[PDB]
């Protein structure tokens, strides 16, 4: 019933020689991409990535594109400013990434507000949980922190975190509800692999589930074999659902003593399977 | 006296003559620089904001043609032409792009 979040993942990557830096903005509602902006395009526009976003009128798309257009200028300047802070040359390609947004609880009250920057893949600065102070990761970030402290940026930011973010989150949740809050139970099965030895391979498959979060465990009559278990990272099937598998190496003939447990939020009760 | 250095202070602009204004940032804490005009009725109107050296823009209003260029990190220029009426040009500086105070230079009084 719980907590939800609205987060924007921002990226600016310079490409000296070729033109201007590539800029992107991606919004996620509970981990699902719903809006997207990419400057490496024809006539770059804020674009809906979920069909339910289409209910937002032209106003929304113009205002959010204008907003991204200005953010894009801030990031171009950030890119040139950092090169000077670290004394790097102008030929190289560098990146800046940001994660901004909030986590809200069931009561609709703000739980957590995020604002973290990374330069070239390493942490640079981040707003603290108090929502008033920043933590710098290097000497270069103290300059930024100092500037932000002087201008009262955390305050500007906190105002967006607790107001605009929260309010919009609620609205996004109201309009994408059915799709956002949908659940597709995973279809499970077990397969047998051998390679002419005295050992077999039991692989537990979890397919076509949504959301992505899932847990698969192999048991030997009560024992969760986490040490002797081999499994892959959850991966996108490409159609909105996900896949995952967990395998264990079992003694030929001792198949029927091993059990796979499928924990997913669409399941009324956890799944339990064996070779068949 | 401000954080900016504008020259000329005033200038007589002949009929078909273009004129040039220069603005120098004295405090590097405020790199966002703009050009604002104030008419004889004394209405301020924003014209340009150019943060990065290389930035150049052309804008034509009723009464004046403008071409602005951020020359260096501390230098903002403006070329005004086809001005049929007097007006004063002010340079402003700010510490960042959104929500920070703008501070005014002393201006360049263009007289006709």
């Amino acid at each position: 019933m719980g907590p939800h979040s609205l987060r924007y993942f921002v990226t600016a990557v310079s490409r000296p020689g070729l033109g201007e830096p590539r800029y992107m903005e991606v919004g996620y509602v509970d981990d699902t991409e719903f809006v997207r902006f990419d400057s490496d395009a024809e006539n770059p526009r804020y674009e809906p990535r979920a069909r339910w976003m289409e209910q937002e009128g032209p106003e929304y798309w113009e205002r959010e594109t204008q907003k991204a257009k200005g953010n894009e200028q801030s990031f171009r300047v950030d890119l040139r400013t950092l090169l000077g802070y670290y004394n790097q040359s102008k030929g190289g390609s560098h990146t800046i990434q940001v994660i901004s947004g909030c986590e809200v609880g069931s009561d609709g009250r703000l739980l957590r507000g995020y604002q973290q920057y990374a330069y070239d893949g390493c942490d640079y600065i981040a707003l603290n949980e108090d929502l008033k102070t920043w933590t710098a990761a290097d000497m270069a970030a103290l300059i930024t922190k100092h500037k932000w402290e002087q201008a009262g940026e955390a305050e500007r930011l906190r105002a967006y975190l607790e107001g605009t973010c929260v309010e919009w989150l609620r609205r996004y949740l109201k309009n994408g509800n059915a799709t956002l809050l949908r659940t597709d139970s995973p279809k499970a099965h077990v397969t047998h692999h051998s390679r002419p030895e005295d050992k077999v391979t039991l692989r537990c498959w979890a397919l076509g589930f949504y959301p992505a979060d899932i847990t698969l465990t192999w048991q030997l009559n009560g024992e969760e074999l986490i040490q002797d278990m081999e499994l892959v990272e959850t991966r996108p099937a490409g159609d909105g659902t996900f896949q995952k598998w967990a395998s264990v190496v079992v003694p030929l003939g001792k198949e029927q003593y091993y059990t796979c447990h499928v924990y997913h939020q669409g399941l009324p009760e956890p799944l339990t399977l064996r070779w068949e | 006296v401000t954080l900016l250095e504008q020259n000329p202070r005033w200038r007589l602009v002949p009929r078909g003559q273009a004129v040039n204004l220069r603005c120098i940032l004295k405090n590097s804490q405020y790199p966002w620089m703009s050009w604002y005009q104030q008419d004889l009725q004394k209405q301020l109107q924003w014209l340009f904001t150019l943060r990065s050296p290389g930035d150049k823009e052309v804008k034509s209003l009723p009464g004046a043609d403008y071409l602005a260029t951020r020359v260096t990190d501390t230098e903002l220029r403006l070329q005004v032409a086809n001005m049929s009426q007097g007006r004063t040009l002010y340079c402003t500086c700010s510490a960042d792009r959104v929500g920070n105070t703008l501070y005014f230079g002393e201006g360049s009084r263009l007289i006709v």
Binding site: N71, T81, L82, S100, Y117, A151, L157, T164 | D96, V98
Partner: peptide, 8 residues
């Protein structure tokens, strides 16, 4: 909707 980012 996203925020209006200042610079570092």
């Amino acid at each position: 909707i996203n925020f209006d980012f200042n610079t570092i």
